[PDB]
């Protein structure tokens, strides 16, 4: 159904994390004012970025790594909005009945 | 109806807060650079984390407590998206009439 | 229609801001580590809190003002989710036709 | 369809960024405690503000630039909520069939 598209986000996002998580630590690590130096840092970062929390304990300073960011942000933001869209039609699905 | 699923989130989330709120202060408190040392701190944290605000005045540094985080984040994020899904079908419910 | 409920949030939220904006600066201002000392500070705060951005340049440290927070957070979070619910049925409204 | 309204946000938001991105660096740059001094800074800012992450590495201190903020915030917040509304009716569109 549409939950095959919902779990599709999950699967697809955990990738974007590991993807940009690693993809990012590289484009960052080594440049001035670097913070995303370790892999597990850039790991926690993505989690905190993809959920739009951003305590600001870690972030990119590289005009390149900052792209990884924008991809990890929209990535997370969209995924959830799509699990919200699933619960939406699911609530309308049981009202299209009753 | 679907509002029994909406209030179901509320109930269910206040738990995840108290849960991870307390569950977290433990896995954190005592480790280097720990900030989530008090219970009422780790309490305010969860509120600020589950709503994705994250001013960054408090956060986990423990690869363990950071899990509590991810659970408290998705927890809040989902819950609201589900109250958004309720208002969604409710607005469609009164349009399925008129 | 349901846009009378959408604009209803707007109206209703600008209140919660001014409300908690002012209501908060009071419960905060004067206590140790206070930051929300000015009215226009506590003003900008609410905007930054109700949209879940929280750069963390301002926040409450008072177990009381922190309540104002939780009310200003959910306030903003809900309001938007309800403008999202309006665009949702509006897109379904034009598909219930075509 | 309603995806012509979805891509309409995208187009329309990238503007609000460049718009406020630039529009902001001006109203800010030069005032005390200014941080949004460079164009590419105020650029990264908007991305981080329109997605409600706000690590707090950059933000406005000018009662004017802070307006640019509120416009960039709602701008992003709304846009996504409208892509969420598209996925919402799209999931209901394939359930209105099956
Ligand atoms: C609630 C605010 N969000 C969280 C993800 C960002 C806009 C909602 C989407
Ligand atoms: K933040
Ligand atoms: K922050
Ligand atoms: K957020
Ligand atoms: K945030």
Swiss-Prot record, chains A, B, C, D:
Keywords: Cell membrane, Ion channel, Ion transport, Ligand-gated ion channel, Membrane, Transmembrane, Transmembrane helix, Transport. GO terms for molecular function: identical protein binding; voltage-gated potassium channel activity. One of its GO terms (biological process) is action potential. It is found in: Cell membrane. One of its GO terms (cellular component) is voltage-gated potassium channel complex. It is a multi-pass membrane protein. Disruption phenotype: Cells grow slower and to lower myceliar densities. Residues 39-49, 50-57 dip into the membrane without crossing it. Residues 28-38, 58-64 are extracellular. Belongs to the potassium channel family. Acts as a pH-gated potassium ion channel; changing the cytosolic pH from 7 to 4 opens the channel, although it is not clear if this is the physiological stimulus for channel opening. Monovalent cation preference is K(+) > Rb(+) > NH4(+) >> Na(+) > Li(+). This is pH-gated potassium channel KcsA. It comes from Streptomyces lividans.
